[PDB]
Design a protein around this ligand. Structure first.
Ligand code: CA
Ligand code: CL
Lengths: 105, 462
């Protein structure tokens, strides 16, 4: 579960992409941002565990970005988790599971 | 640079982690094993990302290196690179590099990646005129004057810096892909000169005037998310656009978009839109974002048959039925609207994410067969019933129905009221203008789980 107030577009990224890097994939959003500023983070394989920092998120904007070219024959899918907090410290959301699919060039 | 005689690997590469990497590269079986200058001279490329390397001391003996990847390490000093003039490509993002002076004479460089570092002064880049790819995001750069002579650049990013003045981009007419997001940019007039631009990403700046984009007719991708746009008349000129992001601005007039029929993705969330008629002909759209606007009539959406992703949340929408023909929809977000009737949602048989919180939904039965759902949102509904006569004792039917068709018992009932299925009853000694009740019921449809909850207001008429 839980969807909460997350708004997430589906995420695919073609393998063998050209720069410049980092490149915007999608903008992640929590509906809690129109009742105060929200600050975003991500976790999982490809984020904070190996391979680290293949994906990053811009804390203030929610822009999820890829930092280098991908290879479908190495890693074809990634499961990430996003997190949302206020000014403040809470946690205006529970984590969201985020699937990223590596597609054709 | 040459080692005088055969030296143990761990005396050349003093970094514990680089020593281990070099042991493997050089085909030795232990870090204390000796290596010659001819062994070192065989290494032409080096993939050494994500190894917790703190020093590249030793790399200066690898004379023939043409490509290096030291990204995602803990590098500060990059002095050992100074004389490695055969270097063509450097990947070195995610380190703690403050001084890039050692790059100044690496004139054969065609690609240089330095995002996520501690770089301020980019003067050492000024003579790297063969560069075709340069990546400088997430540093502390405020002056890009050193970019002015980099006349072979095709890809350039310096997002997440402190740049106000773009004038140094003037002569970089070879630019095809530019990212200037999250800087201090208000004036994009210099961009009128970059007529070969195909992609411009400029989110989170202070841009209000987009007239300089008029002649950039090769643009297929444009992001101006998080600026100060209102007049978007210029975008009518950009007939090649397939991807456009204009979210978080002050746009009300969408007429300039009406001819942009190549568009497959369009973001217009967080604006001043009340009228979507100009979007009716954009039938190649797969993604459309319209959240946080002032929409009521969404009928012009019915034509957009290719939509797989749609946002409508935070609007004034009562009638959701124009989504019924959008049979390819996989994700639909319409929280914070005035929707009561979700009968039309039965048509969206491929729906996977359905976010419908903060509406006026009382009956989940039209959703019962939507078994491809994996994410579901039905919390915090609220509606006001048609008034009923105030009496000493008032009875109303409970109308809250689960996906099974069964009535959901109230969670709480105001004014000491009670429930006997299907009726909610109140003993009211004196006149009151309204009574209310709440419900809260966890529910799963397919594999999507939510709490279907809300507050029902019952006005009493005297
Ligand atoms: Ca917002
Ligand atoms: Cl938005």
């Amino acid at each position: 579960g839980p969807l909460g107030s997350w708004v997430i577009p589906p995420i695919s990224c073609p393998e063998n992409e050209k720069g410049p890097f980092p490149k915007n994939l999608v903008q992640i959003k929590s509906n809690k941002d129109k009742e105060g500023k929200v600050f975003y983070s991500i976790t999982g394989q490809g984020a904070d565990t190996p391979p680290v920092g293949v994906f990053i998120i811009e804390r203030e904007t929610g822009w999820l970005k890829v930092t280098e070219p991908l290879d479908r024959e190495r890693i074809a899918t990634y499961t990430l988790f996003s997190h949302a907090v206020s000014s403040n410290g809470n946690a205006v959301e529970d984590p969201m599971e985020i699937l990223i699919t590596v597609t054709d060039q | 640079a040459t080692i005088t005689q055969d030296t143990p690997i761990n005396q050349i590469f003093t970094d514990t982690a680089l020593a281990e990497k070099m042991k493997t590269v050089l085909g030795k079986t232990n870090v204390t094993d000796t290596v010659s200058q001819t062994d070192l001279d065989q290494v032409t490329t080096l993939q050494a990302d994500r190894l917790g390397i703190k020093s590249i001391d030793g790399v200066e003996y690898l004379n023939n290196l043409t490509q290096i990847n030291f990204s995602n390490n803990q590098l500060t000093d990059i002095t050992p690179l100074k004389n490695l003039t055969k270097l063509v490509d450097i990947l070195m993002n995610n380190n703690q590099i403050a001084d890039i002076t050692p790059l100044a004479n690496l004139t054969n460089l065609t690609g240089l990646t330095l995002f996520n570092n501690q770089i301020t002064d980019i003067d050492p880049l000024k003579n790297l005129t063969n560069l075709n790819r340069l990546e400088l995001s997430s540093n502390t750069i405020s002056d890009i004057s050193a970019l002015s002579g980099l006349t072979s650049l095709q890809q350039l990013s310096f997002s997440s810096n402190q740049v106000t003045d773009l004038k140094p981009l003037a002569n970089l007419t070879t630019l095809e892909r530019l990212d200037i997001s999250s800087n201090k940019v208000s004036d994009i007039s210099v961009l009128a000169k970059l007529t070969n631009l195909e992609s411009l990403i400029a989110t989170n700046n202070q841009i209000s005037d987009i007239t300089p984009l008029g002649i950039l007719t090769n643009l297929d991708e444009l992001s101006l998310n998080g600026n100060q746009l209102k007049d978007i008349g210029t975008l009518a000129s950009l007939t090649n656009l397939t991807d456009l992001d204009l979210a978080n601005n002050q746009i009300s007039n969408l007429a300039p978009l009406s001819g942009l029929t190549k568009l497959t993705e369009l973001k217009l969330g967080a604006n001043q839109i009340s009228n979507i008629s100009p979007l009716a002909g954009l039938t190649a759209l797969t993604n459309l974002e319209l959240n946080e606007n002032q929409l009521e009539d969404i009928s012009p959406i019915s034509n957009l048959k290719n939509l797989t992703y749609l946002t409508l949340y935070f609007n004034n929408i009562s009638d959701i039925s124009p989504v019924s023909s959008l049979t390819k929809l996989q994700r639909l977000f319409f929280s914070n609207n005035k929707v009561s009737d979700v009968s039309s949602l039965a048509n969206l048989t491929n729906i996977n994410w359905l976010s419908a919180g903060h509406n006026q939904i009382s009956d989940l039965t039209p959703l019962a067969n939507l078994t491809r759902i994996t994410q579901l949102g039905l919390n915090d509904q609220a509606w006001t019933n048609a008034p009923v006569n105030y009496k000493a004792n008032v009875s109303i039917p409970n109308t809250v129905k689960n996906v099974t068709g069964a009535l959901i018992a109230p969670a709480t009932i105001s004014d000491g009221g009670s429930y006997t299925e299907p009726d909610i009853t109140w003993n009211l000694p004196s006149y009151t203008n309204e009574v209310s009740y709440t419900f809260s019921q966890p529910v799963t449809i397919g594999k999507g789980t939510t709490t279907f909850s809300g507050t029902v207001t019952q006005p009493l008429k005297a």
